[PDB]
């Protein structure tokens, strides 16, 4: 029975490939040959943040584009005032090995997690004035890789147990568990409408999930190695992914296939993070080579390079208003570019 | 805008308080050494933790040696795919790799050798020294002293290996036991020495699960690692 099941799966995968190929009437590269290229843009470090002791792994911009939170594996979670470089809070973490952080859309809560397999929610506006642990989520069986807030009461989490889950903060129980990924889930991105999200799970594939229906809608398998970064296109109809193969790929949720691949001859290192600008024309990706490249989403060329760091780039996030982009690195320093 | 200046002053006061707190945190942090405990589940690593102490994804054991703070992390409740979460420990002082020597018939010794090679040759772990604990020495001694488990059946190079002249055996061990012990030690070493970079070093140690010297051994390896790093910084080594 197993052989017949595998044969049926292979035949239906071949049917999927044939259907996808039939829709490949033309390539995005050919269509975008006419548009004016961005040329060259040279960003400069406008602010430098210092105070973290160990390597910084993750950060998140606020919805107001003023406050941001960054997580360092020394056990400290710090909230920064982007405009004035001041520090608003310095939350001490129970577990030093924090691997993710998140900022609530309303900003009333901050979440983080790591190798402890527990996601802790911190309340920033307690009447006492001090930061306190509001809720602890301990249903996962692996390190927390990523987490993002849907609202003040709903948070989606990524774990190394190969399954994603939706958590009801007030109840503290998993409302829905997403399964189907083979490898460790690394990055999580919520769609602009908050109804869909995508993630790569170290199996060279990206899965599209429905937050309410609790099932996988589409699967993309254009990558060759583990996927470390994922981010939606600003319109929500496409998303870009970063993988260890040193190539970034853009997928469209309606075409159901890769549109183009971003790569170059002399880059042989994996991508750690990826993000889009407000217009979506600029794709910013962090690399293990201590610098971040800027790619033209349409013309498939490098528009600029950010080389303010001297260690591995761990995180990269653009402001909601698109005014500036902040990048973190293992050197324990954050550079804000504009 | 007097309110703006007032809130700016309040923010500066909060920043000063946070700076003082972070300075204290930095002072305490730099004085503490972090260690990673690794090895197969069948190994005696669990007994070592219990001796030194005398569902979470990681366990922390804190002990003081000569009034020196050491933090040890045991990665439990984690999947066997170590290639991702292992990168987090790229800044640890040393990695305590515990391998049971008496594990040759799955051939757990070969798996341990491959894992050690992977950690040593990893891109991000090249800056971390590895403390190699060769555990279960009594089991190996009783297995090789009289038994049918031939080492050459699983390691054919053993038949043409002789104990090095620069070896110090404990008074009373049979020459065959010492030969097997040093063969395993050199098999582990040949992976590390092959790098030739000198950025990190391996410190093999014949160990028993009940040995109380393990704490002293770890202290000595930490001292040696720090001294070698400082000497290489000063171009002495």
């Amino acid at each position, epitope marked *: 029975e197993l052989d017949q099941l*595998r044969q049926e799966a292979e035949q239906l*995968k071949n049917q999927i490939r044939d259907a996808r190929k039939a829709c490949a009437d033309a390539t995005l590269s050919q269509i975008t040959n006419n548009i004016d290229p961005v040329g060259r843009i040279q960003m400069r470090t406008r602010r430098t943040l210092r105070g973290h002791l160990a390597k910084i792994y993750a950060m998140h911009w606020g919805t107001d584009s003023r406050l941001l939170v960054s997580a360092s594996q020394d056990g400290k979670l710090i909230i920064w005032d982007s405009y004035t470089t001041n520090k608003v809070h310095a939350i001490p973490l129970r577990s030093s090995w924090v691997m993710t952080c998140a900022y609530a859309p309303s900003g009333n809560y901050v979440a983080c997690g790591g190798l402890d397999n527990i996601c802790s929610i911190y309340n920033l506006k307690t009447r006492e004035g001090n930061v306190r642990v509001s809720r602890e989520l301990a249903g996962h069986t692996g390190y927390l890789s990523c987490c993002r807030f849907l609202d003040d009461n709903q948070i989606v989490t990524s774990s190394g147990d190969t399954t994603c889950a939706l958590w009801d903060i007030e109840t503290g129980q998993q409302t829905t568990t997403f399964t189907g990924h*083979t*490898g460790d889930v690394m990055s999580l991105s919520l769609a602009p409408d908050t109804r869909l999200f995508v993630s790569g799970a*170290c*199996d*060279a*594939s990206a899965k599209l999930w429905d937050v309410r229906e609790g099932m996988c809608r589409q699967t993309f*398998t254009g990558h*060759e*190695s*583990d996927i470390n970064a994922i981010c939606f296109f600003p319109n929500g109809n496409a998303f870009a992914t970063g993988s*260890d*193969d*040193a190539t970034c790929r853009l997928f469209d949720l309606r075409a159901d296939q890769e549109l183009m691949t971003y790569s170059h001859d002399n880059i*042989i290192c*994996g991508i750690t993070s990826v993000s889009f600008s407000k217009s979506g024309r600029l794709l910013l990706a962090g690399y293990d080579d201590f610098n971040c490249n800027v790619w033209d989403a349409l013309k498939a060329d490098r528009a600029g390079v950010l080389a303010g760091h001297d260690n591995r780039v761990s995180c990269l996030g653009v402001t909601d208003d698109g005014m500036a982009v902040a990048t973190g690195s293992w050197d324990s320093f954050l550079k804000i570019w504009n | 805008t007097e309110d703006q200046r007032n809130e700016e002053k309040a923010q500066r006061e909060a920043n000063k308080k946070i700076e003082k707190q972070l300075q204290k945190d930095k002072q305490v942090y730099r004085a503490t050494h972090r260690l990673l405990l690794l090895g197969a589940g069948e190994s005696g690593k669990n007994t070592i933790v219990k001796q030194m102490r005398i569902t979470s994804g990681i366990f922390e054991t804190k002990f003081q040696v000569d009034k020196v703070n050491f933090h040890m992390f045991d990665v439990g409740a984690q*999947r*066997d*795919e*170590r*290639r991702k979460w292992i990168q987090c420990f790229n800044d640890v002082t040393a990695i305590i790799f515990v391998v049971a020597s008496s594990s040759y018939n*799955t*051939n757990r010794l*070969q*798996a341990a050798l*491959k894992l050690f090679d*992977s950690i040593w*040759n*990893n*891109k991000w772990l090249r800056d971390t020294s590895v403390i190699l604990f060769l555990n279960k020495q009594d089991l190996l001694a009783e297995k090789v002293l009289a038994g049918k488990s031939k080492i050459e*059946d*699983y*390691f*054919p*190079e053993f038949a043409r290996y002789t104990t090095p002249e620069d070896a110090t055996p404990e008074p009373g061990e049979d020459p065959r036991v010492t030969r097997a012990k040093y063969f395993i030690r050199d098999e582990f070493l040949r992976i590390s020495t092959a790098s030739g970079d000198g950025r990190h070093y391996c410190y093999p140690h014949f160990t028993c699960s009940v040995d109380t010297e393990n704490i002293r051994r770890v202290f000595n390896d930490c001292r040696d690692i720090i001294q070698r790093m400082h000497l290489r910084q000063y171009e002495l080594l």
Partner: nanobody
Amino acid sequence: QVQLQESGGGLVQPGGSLRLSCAASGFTFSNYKMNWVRQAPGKGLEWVSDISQSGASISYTGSVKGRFTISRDNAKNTLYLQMNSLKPEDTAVYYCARCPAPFTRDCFDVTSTTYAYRGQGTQVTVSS
């Protein structure tokens, strides 16, 4: 999609020889290290032999050293494992596995849990 298709197997009398093959597609074959692993009935995964990108470096497990031969053909994205003088203990399902990253010799393809970059495997039986 990353696909690995092992071929060759069946039953062979002890002391014979067998040729295993591994078709590869969906990735740049030359940029990844490859190795062979096996799982005997009732036993866990075992590493057999590995080959570098260009093949200049080759290694075998002690119980297979000098007995089998691992070779790769980057021109047609195929990997081979020549086996001779087989013994009953060699009976096991042999999986053709590719460990994660290119341009790196660090390699973690012995994990017990389902590995995304290994093929279905082929059964090899050694009996009279």
